[PDB]
Amino acid sequence: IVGGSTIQPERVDAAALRQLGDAMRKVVGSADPTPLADLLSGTPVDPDELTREVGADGRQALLDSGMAVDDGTTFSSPLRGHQLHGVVVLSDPDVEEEVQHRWYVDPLWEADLLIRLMLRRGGARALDMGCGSGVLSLVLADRYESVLGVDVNPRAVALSRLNAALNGLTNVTFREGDMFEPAEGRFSRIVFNSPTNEEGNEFVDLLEAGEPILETFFRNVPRKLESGGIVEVNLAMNDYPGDPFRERLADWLGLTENGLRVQIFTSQRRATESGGEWKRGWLVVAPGPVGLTEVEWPYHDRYEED
Numbered sequence: 001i002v003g004g005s006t007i008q009p010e011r012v013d014a015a016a017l018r019q020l021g022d023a024m025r026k027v028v029g030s031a032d033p034t035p036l037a038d039l040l041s042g043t044p045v046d047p048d049e050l051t052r053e054v055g056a057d058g059r060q061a062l063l064d065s066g067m068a069v070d071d072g073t074t075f076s077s078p079l080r081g082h083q084l085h086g087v088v089v090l091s092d093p094d095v096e097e098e099v100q101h102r103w104y105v106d107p108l109w110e111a112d113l114l115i116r117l118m119l120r121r122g123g124a125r126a127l128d129m130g131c132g133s134g135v136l137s138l139v140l141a142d143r144y145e146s147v148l149g150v151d152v153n154p155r156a157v158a159l160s161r162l163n164a165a166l167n168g169l170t171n172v173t174f175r176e177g178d179m180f181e182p183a184e185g186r187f188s189r190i191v192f193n194s195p196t197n198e199e200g201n202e203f204v205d206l207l208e209a210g211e212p213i214l215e216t217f218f219r220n221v222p223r224k225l226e227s228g229g230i231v232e233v234n235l236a237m238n239d240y241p242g243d244p245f246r247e248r249l250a251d252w253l254g255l256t257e258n259g260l261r262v263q264i265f266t267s268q269r270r271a272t273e274s275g276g277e278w279k280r281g282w283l284v285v286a287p288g289p290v291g292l293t294e295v296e297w298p299y300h301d302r303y304e305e306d
């Protein structure tokens with residue numbers, strides 16, 4: 001019911017998308033919403049009021065791309081608008097599991113926090129693994145000569161492309177595929193907002209895919225990373241008695257043997273019902289002395305207070 005809508009940015013001229021992006025930038029996230037802001041916050045709107053804001057071409061572009069649907073008397077949108085860090089982003093509305101389509105796209109739960117954690121440097125070539133709405137890809141595109149975003153969710157790939165087009169971004173490409181498979185060559189920069197939470201080792205769905213997706217990611221990251229390259233991962237970690245996450249991580253990465261420096265910043269923590277520990281934190285691979293370090297950083301709390 002939510003997250004299966006058809007998204008078709010190829011059905012609309014790039015200039016028309018950029019223009020809609022321009023209008024969105026004026027109103028999405030700001031007080032006293034116009035019909036376009038209303039549309040993109042889930043409120044059905046009168047088509048004629050919309051026309052005056054985006055033009056009859058804009059109206060058609062909204063329809064052709066899947067951004068709006070004609071309920072006869074009113075238009076409504078399956079998507080919701082965000083504006084943040086210089087970028088306008090459409091994604092699915094935040095709703096509960098029971099009403100989520102299998103292709104439901106991350107409604108930007110942690111996006112804004114993660115952007116603020118990311119190192120400020122830019123560079124040659126960036127990869128955004130599991131790109132979702134494309135939000136992180138869009139932000140990286142300002143700093144990096146080109147950006148590739150990858151997702152196994154084909155609808156996320158469409159959404160990302162639409163979002164790139166709305167912002168008039170030229171240097172960002174998206175590909176459908178499984179993990180690193182459609183990502184050819186090596187990268188200066190790799191970001192992974194990983195689909196892990198409380199599911200332990202078990203695949204539940206594309207937003208809670210289990211620890212094996214992290215294993216696949218980190219085993220393959222050495223061969224995908226330019227020397228001196230940076231990796232940033234948002235993830236959940238499960239420590240089991242006699243079996244801490246970091247030693248599995250060390251084995252996956254071939255840490256000593258590939259000469260990587262890794263830092264795990266742990267933000268949240270709770271005892272598990274087996275004497276182990278669940279953690280949430282932020283993992284950084286960056287140039288420097290080979291080895292693994294764990295540091296405390298309660299950035300969730302700090303983000304909440306400021």
Ligand SMILES: Nc1ncnc2c1ncn2[C@@H]1O[C@H](CSCC[C@H](N)C(=O)O)[C@@H](O)[C@H]1O
Pocket residue numbers: 105106108109110111129130131132133134135136150151152153156177178179193194195206207209213
């Ligand atoms: N095997 C796989 N290969 C590529 N992407 C995958 C994948 N399994 C899950 N994903 C994707 O990983 C994403 C995690 S949510 C993060 C989305 C976006 N980067 C953001 O920060 O908002 C989801 O979009 C999910 O579809």
Ligand SMILES: [Mg+2]
Pocket residue numbers: 097204205207208
């Ligand atoms: Mg789920």
